Design a binder for this molecule. Structure first.
Ligand SMILES: [Cl-]
Ligand SMILES: [Cl-]
Lengths: 70, 70
């Protein structure tokens, strides 16, 4: 998995806010979402989801988060 | 995630055979399966599955594999 997709995932994982991650990364939100979308399409699992209008880290998102810090 | 659970996951991921992983790790198969089972219960996603009598690495298993090598 590519360094920059990983960096975007971790930023969104940390901010829990895509537009905020984009500002931090100095890229556009759609760019942030395309990085995430590529990982989700490549691995076939969602990493984030909205539930009742609030961003959530999925079970696979949490596994990715912890694996990256090992 | 604990060093030894990670090591067991990678061994099974590599051998694609639990009894073989156990022999390699010098622990019993049920021990191997308990390590894996703990990760799967903790993260809520399966890492392996049998499909038509053959061991498979799941989508989450592949994500874990690649994340651990980053
Ligand atoms: Cl958001
Ligand atoms: Cl097996």
């Amino acid at each position: 998995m590519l360094d920059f997709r990983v960096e975007t995932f971790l930023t969104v994982c940390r901010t829990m806010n895509y537009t905020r991650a984009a500002e931090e990364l100095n890229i556009t939100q759609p760019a942030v979402s395309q990085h995430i979308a590529h990982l989700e399409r490549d691995y076939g699992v969602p990493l984030f989801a909205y539930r009742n209008k609030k961003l959530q880290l999925t079970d696979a998102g949490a596994l990715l988060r912890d694996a990256l810090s090992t």
